[PDB]
Structures are given as C-alpha cells and as structure tokens.
Design a protein around this ligand. Structure first.
Ligand SMILES: CN1CCC[C@H]1COc1nc(N2CCNCC2)c2cnc(-c3cccc4cccc(Cl)c34)c(F)c2n1
Ligand SMILES: Nc1nc2c(ncn2[C@@H]2O[C@H](COP(=O)(O)OP(=O)(O)O)[C@@H](O)[C@H]2O)c(=O)[nH]1
Ligand SMILES: [Mg+2]
Length: 170
C-alpha cells in the first residue's frame, strides 16, 4: 500500500484496548484476550481514497519506564487515549498517558484521539460531557466506542489517521 501509519493504543488495564484492536482487524469481539500480551497488528484500509497501512501497537504488560520503552513509544505517530465509560479510574488515568506521550515525543502537539469505550454498557460512571470537555481542553477529537458492537471503532482509528494527516501539514 501507499502510506504507513504507526498507531499506538494506550490506557489502563481492562478498558478494552485489545478488544478494540481485534475488532478493527478481525471484525470480531474477543472477550478475553490475554491481558499481559503487548503486540502489534497491521490493517490495510482505504481512508478518504488513500490506501493506508495501519500498524497498531496494543500496549500491555509491566508498567516500566526504561529508556528502551521510551524509544519504542517514541516511534508511534498517533495515539488512542482509551478509558472505559464504566470506570472513573481509567478516565482519571488519561492525564498520565497524555503526559507520557508528550514526554517521549518531546512535543505538546502529538496526534491523539480520546476514546470512551464500552459504550454498550448501561453502568456508566463517566459523563459524555466530562469527556468532551477534557478532549476540548486537549484540542483533540473524542469518539465513543464499543468493541462489543463495533460502534465507533472505525471512526476512532480513522479519525486518528486524519489527525496525523493534519499534523503533517502544519
Ligand atoms: C501507577 N501508574 C502510574 C499512574 C497510573 C498507573 C498505571 O499507568 C501506566 N501503566 C502502564 N501499564 C500498567 C499495567 N499493564 C499495562 C502497562 C504503563 C505502561 N507503559 C507506559 C509507558 C512507559 C514509558 C513511556 C510511555 C510513552 C507513551 C505512552 C506510554 Cl503507555 C508509556 C506507561 F506510561 C504506563 N503507565
Ligand atoms: N461490554 C463490553 N465489554 C468490553 C468492551 N471492550 C472490552 N470489553 C471486555 O472488557 C475486558 C477488558 O478487555 P481487554 O480488551 O482485555 O482490555 P485491555 O486490558 O485494555 O486490553 C474483557 O473482558 C473484554 O471482553 C466493550 O466495548 N464492551
Ligand atoms: Mg490487552
């Protein structure tokens, strides 16, 4: 294909990063992907007429801040900041992940999208308004998703590609 994109999915354990990744790639809901396994996948898609090679890093594993991990994260071109709408802690952690991205990217303008996952669940504890206000403060889009139903999944990843395109033309 034509353009390759290095996307990175970050967020607390259990918010659905693996399930979102497998949905995009396989169009199936995996309800228990090994929570410790970090891996990357490829999706070849046409987005707005451009053939796109999406490399998606589904982050997982031990929390560690070695120079080596910083450099691996530094290679990502755009990030999904994922929380789960039924998990306030995962939303409170969003600040941490945004700041780690900025730290290793050494920049305040990195392509990012805010993702509220598990939108199918009725047990909401994070208001849609709160997430919109945060994403507005960050200057990034906000997409509600459900890896279970595939709601918003294509929109989230494709919006991230569009944010990378915008960044490149700045
Ligand atoms: C006590 N912690 C601090 C406040 C909340 C809580 C957990 O925060 C958390 N947890 C992780 N793990 C938790 C256990 N399983 C999954 C991995 C992380 C893994 N790697 C990186 C990471 C490392 C280095 C550079 C990055 C540059 C960009 C992006 C990332 Cl994501 C980066 C982290 F920052 C992680 N932060
Ligand atoms: N109802 C619902 N459950 C989900 C959704 N996404 C993930 N899960 C479930 O939430 C748990 C965490 O999923 P995982 O994909 O393993 O989260 P990660 O730890 O961020 O990779 C698993 O039991 C998944 O089946 C979603 O959109 N809706
Ligand atoms: Mg996982």
């Amino acid at each position: 294909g034509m353009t390759e994109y290095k996307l990175v999915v970050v967020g607390a354990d259990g918010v659905g990063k693996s399930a979102l990744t497998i949905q995009l790639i396989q169009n199936h809901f995996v309800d228990e992907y090994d929570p410790t396994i970090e891996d990357s996948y490829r999706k070849q898609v046409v987005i707005d007429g451009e053939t796109s090679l999406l490399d998606i890093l589904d982050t997982a594993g031990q929390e560690e801040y070695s120079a080596m991990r910083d450099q691996y994260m530094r290679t990502g071109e755009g990030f999904l900041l994922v929380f789960a709408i039924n998990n306030t802690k995962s939303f409170e952690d969003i600040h941490h992940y945004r700041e780690q991205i900025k730290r290793v990217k050494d920049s305040e303008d990195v392509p990012m999208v805010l993702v509220g996952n598990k939108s199918d669940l009725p047990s909401r504890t994070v208001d849609t308004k709160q997430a919109q206000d945060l994403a507005r403060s960050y200057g990034i889009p906000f997409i509600e998703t459900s890896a279970k139903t595939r709601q918003g999944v294509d929109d989230a990843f494709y919006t991230l590609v569009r944010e990378i395109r915008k960044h490149k033309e700045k």
